[PDB]
Amino acid sequence: ATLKDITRRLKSIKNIQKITKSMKMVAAAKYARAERELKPARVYGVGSLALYEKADIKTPEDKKKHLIIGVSSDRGLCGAIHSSVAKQMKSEAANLAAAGKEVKIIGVGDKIRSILHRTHSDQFLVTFKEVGRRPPTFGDASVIALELLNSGYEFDEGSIIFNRFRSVISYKTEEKPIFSLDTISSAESMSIYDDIDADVLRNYQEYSLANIIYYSLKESTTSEQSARMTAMDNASKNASEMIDKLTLTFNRTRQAVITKELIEIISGAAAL
Amino acid sequence: VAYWRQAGLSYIRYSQICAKAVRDALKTEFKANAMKTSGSTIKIVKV
Amino acid sequence: DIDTAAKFIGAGAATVGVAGSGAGIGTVFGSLIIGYARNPSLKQQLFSYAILGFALSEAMGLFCLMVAFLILFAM
Amino acid sequence: DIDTAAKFIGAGAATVGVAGSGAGIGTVFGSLIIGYARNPSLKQQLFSYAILGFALSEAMGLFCLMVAFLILFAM
Amino acid sequence: DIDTAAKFIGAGAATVGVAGSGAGIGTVFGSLIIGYARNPSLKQQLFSYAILGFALSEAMGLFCLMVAFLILFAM
Amino acid sequence: DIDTAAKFIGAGAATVGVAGSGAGIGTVFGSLIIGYARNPSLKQQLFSYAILGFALSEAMGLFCLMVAFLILFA
Amino acid sequence: DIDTAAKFIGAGAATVGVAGSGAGIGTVFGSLIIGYARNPSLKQQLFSYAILGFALSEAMGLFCLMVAFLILFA
Amino acid sequence: DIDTAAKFIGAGAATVGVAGSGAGIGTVFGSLIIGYARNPSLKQQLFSYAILGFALSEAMGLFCLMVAFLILFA
Amino acid sequence: DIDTAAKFIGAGAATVGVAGSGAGIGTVFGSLIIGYARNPSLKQQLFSYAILGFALSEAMGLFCLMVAFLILFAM
Amino acid sequence: DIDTAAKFIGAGAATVGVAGSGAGIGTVFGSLIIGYARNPSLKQQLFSYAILGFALSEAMGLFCLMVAFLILFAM
Amino acid sequence: QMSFTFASPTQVFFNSANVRQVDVPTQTGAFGILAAHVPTLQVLRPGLVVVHAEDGTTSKYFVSSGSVTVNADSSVQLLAEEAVTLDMLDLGAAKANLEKAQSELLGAADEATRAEIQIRIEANEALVKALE
């Protein structure tokens, strides 16, 4: 290729390498924050699920109005993470219909809405954005729970889908169930719990919903930051490799151009 | 049933208000960091 | 005659059996307060049951007030 | 006659036993209100049990009146 | 004479019918305390119910007061 | 007769002991209503206990009534 | 004086109505104890209501006491 | 004799003391039902307490009955 | 000499009013037990109210016995 | 001799004062059952309070029995 | 014995700990929890949690709201959205806020606004009682 063309390509690709390195370091810092911010929130959330594992709260197959929540940010450079939950959603979001059960959908994050739009635009009842631009906070989960309750879709069996942060190297797409008051007040595993009305359970569920959503927010944010670290580092390595290759090509073209200039100079000198 | 369930609220609004009170009753130097990690950055897009 | 004395004493004793109903009504209207405070929404049905219980207790307290009157006036 | 004066005393003191029946019915229909307020879903079974208890308390109330009259009229 | 003597005895036995009213007011104003302790955001309605129940028990104690005064002055 | 006119007093005084049984059956059935409204999935044990308590209260009331009748007819 | 003996028996029978007041005060203060163990923040108003209930249930027994006295002295 | 008339009167009017046993057994067996409904895991200690309570209430019931029969045979 | 056989009746009837205090003490101490079991850390104030209620019901019990002792030994 | 009659009648009518103690013991040992169903780890203190209350109720039960015995022959 | 887990979204005070007693304020009514308490699922109200650890020790935290869950196996989970140790609270500012809420309750246009103001008043009353 022309010397100037590869020159411009080299400059642009070097700029890409520098910007990716900067953003990789930024994402590393944000992960360092998220891991600490998640050490206590993991205890809190895992506590908020103690009831539904010490009590055999089964799924009452009769009930059909289901609900699916998928968590993810709106930022995109992270990549893999979104492609995970989206897929996980679709699968389950399909099988529920394969039983005559309805399915609504809440999308936490732009990317989920974007990915699922084409084939599920009819099912989104509410959607949320500006997640991931800041570290998620319990106020965010309270707002999501308020919008899940106010909007009068009394789901009978829900599911939240997130990328539990397994470790720096990898995550894992998990799905925590969600029970409505009906499945709780009519479970013969909860005849022991004392001094509970049918209104105490209402408040308890309207709180545990926020608990689980906040748990998912924290897990998803940590896993997303780790995946962003890895992806940005991989892109930096790719840019470095391609810079090496194109710089070698540039050296070859530079030598060729110098040789052409020399031969033209000597030919002109003889012909002068 | 409480007076805020007759009025038509939910335990989430109740607990939001109670937490906001407990927070803006804090000693000033704590309140700075308490306000952080207690916001609400979400905005809702209506379908 | 002792007969008038017997009438007076018998009526007096028979009017001691109204205390049971006098306490049963209080029990009913205490439980009403407790239930209403514990779930105010279904207040109208709380009255339904409270009035039913009041009627059914006052009735069987007057079951003995009538015996008092009967002894006092007739035989 | 003394008996024409003692039968009245016996009846006016025996009828005092319906007080316990009145208190028992009061308690039954107070517990009905409370239990319903707690768990309004079982209204029907709650009422069934309440009416059962009502019957079994006024049973003793009516035994006390039975003795009162038997002393007053029969023997 | 035993006429006025039996009058005094019968009046003194009938006046005991306010034992029931005393116990009933105790139960009513205790359940008021409990119900208010559970949900003090409906105090006015609770006090209304308490006054209602207290009146309905004092009335059927006033019944035995009526019989006592009747035997005391009239016959 | 003084004795036949005191047997009546004895019986009509010893029969007012059934107020206890009346109240103690009211309380047992009120407690059954409460304890079944709380834990409906039992029922079978609660009614067993309630019938047992009723049986004992009935036994006390009938003991009073039999003392009344063994004062009258004896 | 058969009327004196009748007055004595009348006071003895009419002073039994203090039992109702005793049981009533017992119930009122038991309710106060429970309702205070359930909400210590409302101590003042709980005590006010308990005092009101005591006043009334004790009045319903002081009525019997005054009746017994006036029988003994009228 | 009038002493026998008084025997019948007194030993009948002493049998009313089984009314307390009726009411107390009702209360014990209602509290047992409520407690067992609340915490069905303690079914064995709630009952070991209920039988103790019933025996205690029969204590007073029998005291009253025994005094009545003692007066009949004093 | 009838009065020597009427003081006894009056006192043996006046003693009947200690049953109310016997019931009241049981109620107050049962309520103390329940309130304690629910909130074990308020033991002190709970016991203070318990002894207050015990005093205020045995007040009535001792008033009944005082009337009883007035009848026999002091007319 | 009606002072071999009023003695018996007063004794029999004073032993009735044990009914209240029976009811009090019933309430105390019902409250113990409920409270222990709530906190099983307080049994040793709930039972302390229950014994205190039962002693305080049999106290007045025995007050009535001792009045009855004092009247009967020890008068 | 008991196994306690007291947590907040930010921090964790006790984590599978082992205390002797926990007094919690709940909507139905304040109560204390010991080893084998009966299971319950209450939801808190602005109040004062008091933890007695296995020793004679005793510590206090003001909890704004949340949920207490006594489980069958003596596992207590107490989650609060904003649990603060009792020192970090400014009593003067709490008094001022209580006064402001009391004043504003009168202008209760919509029922929801009235309930919101009343909830604020209740929370500040709990603060004032705890701090005095």
Author numbering:
A (entry chain G): 1 to 272
B (entry chain I): 1 to 47
C (entry chain N), D (entry chain M), E (entry chain O), I (entry chain Q), J (entry chain R): 1 to 75
F (entry chain L), G (entry chain P), H (entry chain K): 1 to 74
K (entry chain H): 15 to 146
Article sentences:
The membrane-bound rotor consists of a ring of eight identical c-subunits in close association with a single static a (or ATP-6) subunit, attached to the asymmetrical central stalk (subunits γ, δ, and ε) which extends from the membrane domain and penetrates into the extrinsic globular catalytic domain along its central axis. Focused local refinement of the rotor (c8-ring plus subunits γ, δ, and ε), the stator (subunits OSCP, b, d, and F6 and associated supernumerary subunits e, f, and g) and the membrane domain (subunits a, A6L, b, d, e, f, g, j, k, and the c8-ring) improved the quality of the maps and the resolutions in these regions to 3.5 to 3.7, 4.2 to 6.0, and 3.6 Å. As it rotates, the asymmetrical central stalk brings about structural changes in the three catalytic sites, found mainly in each of the three β-subunits, which alternate with three noncatalytic α-subunits in the spherical extrinsic domain. In the current structure, the postphosphate release angles are 28.8°, 26.2°, and 25.5° in states 1 to 3, respectively. Therefore, the rotational angle in the F1-domain is not influenced significantly by interactions with the additional components of the intact enzyme that are absent from the isolated F1-domain.
Adenosine triphosphate (ATP), the fuel of life, is produced in inner membranes of the mitochondria of eukaryotic cells by an embedded molecular machine with a rotary action, called ATP synthase. Mitochondrial ATP synthases occupy the inner membranes of the organelle and form dimers via specific interactions in their membrane domains.
